[PDB]
Design a protein around this nucleic acid. Structure first.
Lengths: 636, 636
DNA sequence: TTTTTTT
DNA sequence: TTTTTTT
């Protein structure tokens, strides 16, 4: 009954599960799987607890459809790191079974043909591109499952409306032509049934945590529980002191990185003045061995006191700090929102510290994500969450203590709808306007109960379509997998380039490669003028040929702002390709050390997208210049 | 004794010779081969008759050295067509023997590795490039023979000073370090011994023609022989009439192409009004079948009367006219200087017509080349040469009848000497100035008895060298195989291009490809303005970016003249790559139909030379643009 | 304070 | 009126 080995599943999967330490499943898994015709092609939406095997139901369901129907099954995750972890887990499981597992996260290409894969794991954007390419190829017949994780982001996010568009597209094409199951999961929402009806699915929600969570708010010198009950000047040092005495973990969250690192050593100073080691020296040697080896105030308190962790560090140095937390050594740390959604680091007591984060009240989802970190897999007994706040912000703490998530919206003229219709008209599926009205009648906005007719008006004033048939520019946007809003910027960049390209240096090819801004770093004025008015004569001429001019910099339109904000990002990569050591570039430019290494990953991706933008349009000369350099930018 | 089969030679060679119709050798071959130590490494210079097996001695000698020493043997010819004919002959002979025969003529590449060849046949320029590349590689040890044909061009030509430079270079490098024989031949010169001494060679000259040549000058109504003797109003029709009656061939030469074709039908009109056939209709069908098929006044008199032949016709149509002369059909024709040095077409009587050719007296070499066409291999009995001239130009006929060739010059600051020293200093052979004086002491100018010191002065003011060591520009000139005078023009073309290359159309890549002018065709003014001031907006902008400007065209420096004279040649190829039919392009541009098809061959060669000019200098971006198009220009 | 596309 | 280079 309440044990997975009793159920029918391949033996190797349960050997792999029990080898890790997995045990008998809880009741919510049985309730999810025994809802009725869920095991069949009827879809399913469930809300199992996040910290108690939420993905087990979907993982068990994904085998049945790809073994019986044997068509395909996607898998969608929001972030690259969790995508990689799930990719490795699904590898060790399914490849042992024999079901091929493919990854699309980050810059990692599949390196294999699509038509011989089953459980391709993507990160929304890759899945959307794959679906669009399949539709533009007339190969949707091979699709059996679309497993969607974290369904609650479809309404308020910059990457969930893609999930909405994908789901309505596949549902429309399948019904107009359930052989395809759209099983998914969310955390907890009031209007979960309305989502299930639009997916033609059942529904069941549960609420039970493996470790009871003692949630409290501390004011002055007392502890008050959630329901205004007393159970037992910040005194965080005292609070931290009572926790390490029972050889367990502690964790506190801070609203800023400067506050994060300062408070990890302010407490350390108050710890040394009052006053395991086998691996305590291995990490110290690792600190000096590093290629950068800055060895800042972190080095002082790695073995002795309290260190800090955030995203302003190197992917290796930042990750290593999390490595010690898994074994022992350091116990106390500050993290900011880095561990809120980055990775999962359990701790005994979590001090959310200030109720207000970033000048605004902490979000209900963010607070629940922060608090849910506490609790191991039975190692500890109770999890705690302390919110230190005095006098003011009293109502903020209690209201955030007793709150619920808002219902799901639809985020739907709107740019999330312009792309919605431009991937079926171009795909050849929806051609006639009368038939086009059928497609919008089955979208999720229909179940949540015009502007649809005006959608093609914007696609006529701006050349995207021409019964309706695809064009060269309309087809080019979908192949590159970028929104139609961005095409109007990249298109104008390449048209101006063909009239007098500069071939001697590499600054002109760099400008057409760097991603726009992505809000990577605040731009420091009065430093560009010092940096710009020293460039060689060969580099200043390229800047005047792309839009940059001494008429806006330090002298104070989106098009004029987009061609000047792209120059600063291009100059940073100029010293990366010339093998200048990282020590000086992060100081001359005045950019943070944790952001420079994040531009290199985002620059190799954008380089390989513009060559495709010209292939599907047709430009033989511009391909050679862009394609012969995209490899050089990756190095250095 | 006087028969080649008696001598020691491979049997298959003599089977191949006698199958064609070759017979016992004459006395001059025996005298050449039995001069003493000529058969050894001692060099040889001989002057056997041109129409009586001149090349037989060299062909027989080339086998012994490549079979005994087995190092290499070059072969140098002045023209592409004779090079191809000799390539096929040497193929059928040596490949039957087993000695590999390689060709370098025209655009035909060897398509095989150099290090596995013996008798590579070149056309001066290819041989010079091969020698320079071997020297810049330290591989001169593998060289056993350099057979040079038509040694009399080393003094007065645009392509013989290359032979002089090659010979002095190889002699200097061999003696300073005869293992290499430099056996060659010339027609007849007074100072032949002085040439033999500088080559360290014997000498023997002969004068005996297989067919006695009755050379006469006709004035009025009488015939006078060479030595003012009478033997027997132009009356060329009468002269032609008495020749076809004995079923043999006739031929007359004209000073112009318009005169050539007019006089071939003026006589035809005077022939029809007074008034074999199996193949007479095959050629007529070929005339209309042609891809062009203009079928001008040539078509009227191909089967009936007299046609014309020159270089203003297609390589196939012009060649076919010569094909009929080999079998039968047409007998009378006019040729201009086309058959003087192009190909060998024997005829019974040759009418040189006007003593003055091209507004100047006919050259002694040209007149001897023209007259020597008469006479078959024993088919006829006597050859004749008629010079029709009245009143004026009387002294011109007799003086040209009794004349001899001028002695060999040395053509050596002089641009033939700047390149002479720039291929050893760059090659690393001659480094020290004291040693550099040794090289110039063994050149042919030494035997014909300062400015040598000033030679390196021009190589310092203009960057070509930097003890002396090669540089990037100096090395780049030799790899491309073009004279240092031309580099200073091509170099300035590419430097300006890197500042604002235009990538949309193909006019900018065309300009850097077209050969400079080579005096291909007279430029017709007042037609360019009509043609230029109608181009699209995308093409006019390219012209202003390369040097062309509306400040010199039709409004009236070598650099300013070289950038404007190259534009007309570039526009002709613009309609070749757009698949415009040849019918209209030869009329809109006003260029001759026989010159348009000569630009296509000379444009594919220059396209592949500029990519190498940037390789040996180092320019990654400009290579891709030039190399990706050089194939497109070849087509169409 | 914190992420994500293409061959 | 008539020719010739490089991968």
């Amino acid at each position: 009954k309440l044990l997975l080995a009793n159920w029918g599943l391949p033996k190797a999967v349960l050997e792999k599960y029990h080898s890790f330490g997995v045990k008998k499943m809880f009741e919510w898994q049985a309730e999810c799987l025994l809802l009725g015709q869920v095991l069949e092609g009827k879809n399913l939406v469930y809300s199992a607890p996040t910290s108690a095997g939420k993905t087990l139901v979907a993982e068990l369901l994904i085998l049945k459809r790809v073994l019986e129907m044997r068509k395909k099954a996607l898998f969608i995750l929001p972030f690259v790191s969790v995508a990689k972890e799930k990719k490795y887990y699904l590898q060790s499981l399914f490849q042992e079974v024999g079901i091929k597992v493919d990854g699309y996260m980050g810059s990692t290409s599949p390196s294999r043909h699509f038509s011989s894969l089953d459980i391709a794991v993507c990160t929304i954007e890759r899945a959307n591109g794959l679906i669009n390419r399949l539709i533009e190829e007339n190969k949707m017949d091979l699709l059996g499952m679309v497993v969607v994780d974290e369904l609650h982001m479809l309404g308020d996010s910059h990457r969930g409306y893609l999930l909405e568009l994908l789901l309505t597209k596949i549902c429309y094409i399948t019904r107009k032509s359930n052989a395809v199951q759209i099983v998914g999961m969310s955390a907890t929402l009031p209007n979960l049934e309305l989502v299930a009806s639009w997916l033609n699915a059942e529904l069941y929600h549960t609420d039970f945590r493996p470790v009871p969570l003692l949630e409290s708010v501390k004011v002055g010198n007392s502890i008050y529980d959630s329901s205004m009950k007393l159970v037992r000047e910040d005194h965080v040092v005292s609070l931290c002191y009572e926790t390490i005495c029972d050889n367990h973990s502690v964790l506190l969250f801070c609203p800023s990185k400067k506050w994060c690192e300062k408070l990890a050593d302010i407490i350390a100073r108050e710890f040394y003045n009052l006053h395991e080691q086998k691996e305590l020296l291995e990490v110290m040697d690792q600190l000096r061995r590093l290629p950068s080896g800055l060895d800042s105030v972190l080095q002082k308190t790695v073995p002795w006191g309290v260190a800090f962790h955030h995203a302003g560090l190197t992917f290796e140095e930042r990750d290593i700090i999390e490595g010690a937390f898994r074994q022992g050594l350091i116990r106390v740390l500050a993290a900011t929102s880095t561990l809120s959604s980055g990775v999962n680091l359990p701790a005994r007591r979590v001090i959310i510290r200030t109720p207000i984060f970033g000048g605004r009240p902490l979000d209900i989802l963010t607070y629940k994500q922060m608090v849910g970190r506490a609790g191991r897999k039975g190692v500890d007994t109770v999890g705690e969450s302390i919110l230190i706040c005095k006098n003011s912000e009293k109502s903020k703490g209690i209201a955030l203590l007793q709150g619920s998530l808002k219902p799901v919206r639809s985020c739907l003229v709107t740019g999330s709808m312009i792309r919605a219709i431009l991937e079926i008209i171009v795909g050849g599926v929806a051609s006639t306007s009368q038939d086009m009205h059928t497609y919008a009648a089955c979208t999720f906005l229909a179940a949540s109960m015009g502007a649809i007719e005006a959608c093609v008006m914007w696609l006529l004033e701006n050349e995207f379509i021409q019964v309706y048939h695809p064009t060269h520019l309309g087809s080019a946007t979908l192949s590159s997998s970028l929104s139609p809003a961005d095409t109007l910027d990249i298109f104008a960049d390449l048209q101006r380039a063909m009239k007098g390209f500069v071939l001697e240096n590499d600054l002109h090819i760099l400008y057409l490669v760097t991603p726009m801004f992505e809000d990577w770093t605040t731009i420091d004025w009065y430093r560009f003028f010092c940096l710009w008015e020293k460039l060689p004569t060969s580099m200043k001429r390229v800047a005047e040929l792309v839009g940059v001019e001494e008429g806006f910099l330090a002298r104070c339109q989106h098009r004029q702002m987009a061609i000047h904000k792209r120059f600063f990002t291009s100059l940073v990569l100029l010293d990366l390709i010339s093998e200048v050591p990282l020590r000086e570039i992060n100081q001359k430019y005045g950019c943070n050390r944790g952001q420079i290494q994040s531009l290199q990953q985002s620059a190799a991706v954008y380089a390989g997208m513009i060559t495709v933008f010209s292939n599907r349009l047709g430009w033989h000369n511009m391909e050679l210049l862009l394609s012969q350099f995209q490899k050089r930018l990756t190095f250095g």
